[PDB]
Design a binder for this molecule. Structure first.
Ligand SMILES: [Zn+2]
Ligand SMILES: [Zn+2]
Ligand SMILES: [Zn+2]
Ligand SMILES: [Zn+2]
Lengths: 235, 239
């Protein structure tokens, strides 16, 4: 219908044009060195005040409704399935990582053990976890955390060598780039838990368990890899 | 002090204090007024490592002042050079607030509330940034809240139902600081046998108490923002 087509043009002018100008050729969308701006991303995907949420409220209130964090179509106006997938992916990321109106989440890590590993050191935005042999406990982390030098790093001591660096990933997305490198799987019998494993250069495993406050915690940001904001709302 | 101390004080006012006062004079929480201070602008000044104040300290005072965790300590005591004690107290108050409420580089913290009971109170409704807690004297549970929480209409409110009347409003405080304005009104004391807990009580207009227990993640949680009430950023670093 003409109303549907005018809405598609408005969606590009009000939202998509600016989204692509901000995030083209930026990590996490692409595996590149240049980082997406977290405050700019918040301005687009904030749950209630973001540019996308406001567009949905101002133009689609009668055909699309919130169901907690989900966006559900109200039972020549058929939605582009890519548009529905995209807004649902962004609403899930906003619910986990942008609750305060800016990027910010908490999670906990518990260090694990591995044959031949004497020590592990994981750092994110100057929050350090050194594990040698203390009783393993859950350490709370914040992402992002205010620092002059943001980034994440991981190191280990083996039975064959002194301290070695697995990776040093600078920038506000350092933690996310590091998580992208881990082997990840559901933790057996751990509520909202994931077993993380980084295979170090000597073949040894650097093991941790991740526990979140909600959903996938920081792993949710990986849903932005190769993410495309559709240019159309209706088919 | 000496010409070097005076030049540094002048740089402190040009780089930091002039802008701080332009942003925050006659704004809540600094003054008990209707106009609200900007939370993103406040973060740009007091962020622990990246804030305008922290950067001034790093760029101009690295040889006479250093960090000890979240704290700022004089080394410094170079001959005839002495800090204004109000300057040291002020940066340490801001450091404490930043450590509790600005860990992500923007305003943001979590806390939990558990509702309590009072004679003649049949319901209480507490709302902050559209997060609602309705209590009707059943088995009490903890509810998690975030401040700020993204919403089109920020603010906080509290209402109650009593034996003498239906729903009454205790307060409706709009704006990003609504929760803080509401917490300011409560009687507060350490909770008996609750780790990092405070018992909060609002004395409603009918004389009945609207009781809650607050549990925080770190320090005073949202109560730390009350340290900004009547806060003055000193115009001088050195005497
Ligand atoms: Zn937390
Ligand atoms: Zn720091
Ligand atoms: Zn909402
Ligand atoms: Zn007061």
């Amino acid at each position: 219908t003409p109303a549907a087509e005018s809405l598609n043009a408005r969606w590009r002018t009000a939202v998509v044009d600016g989204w692509n100008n901000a995030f083209s050729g930026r990590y996490p969308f692409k595996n590149v060195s240049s980082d997406a701006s977290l405050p700019l991303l918040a301005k687009y995907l904030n749950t209630d005040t973001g540019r996308i949420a406001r567009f949905l409220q101002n133009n689609l209130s009668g055909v699309l409704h919130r169901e907690g964090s989900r966006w559900v179509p109200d039972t020549g106006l058929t939605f582009n399935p890519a548009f529905l997938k995209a807004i649902n992916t962004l609403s899930e990321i906003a619910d986990v990582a942008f609750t305060t109106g800016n990027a910010g989440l908490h999670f906990e890590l518990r260090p694990g053990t591995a044959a031949g590993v004497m020590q592990t050191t994981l750092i994110t935005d100057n929050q350090k976890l050194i594990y040698v042999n203390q009783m393993p406990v859950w350490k709370r982390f914040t992402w992002p955390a205010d620092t002059e030098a943001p980034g994440a790093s991981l190191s280990w001591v083996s039975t064959q060598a002194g301290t070695r660096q697995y990776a040093d990933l600078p920038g506000s997305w350092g933690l996310i780039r590091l998580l992208e490198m881990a082997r990840r799987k559901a933790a057996p019998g751990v509520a909202s838990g994931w077993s993380l494993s980084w295979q170090a250069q000597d073949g040894r495993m650097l093991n941790y368990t991740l526990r979140t406050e909600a959903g996938e915690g920081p792993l949710v940001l990986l849903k932005l890899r190769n993410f495309v904001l559709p240019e159309t709302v209706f088919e």
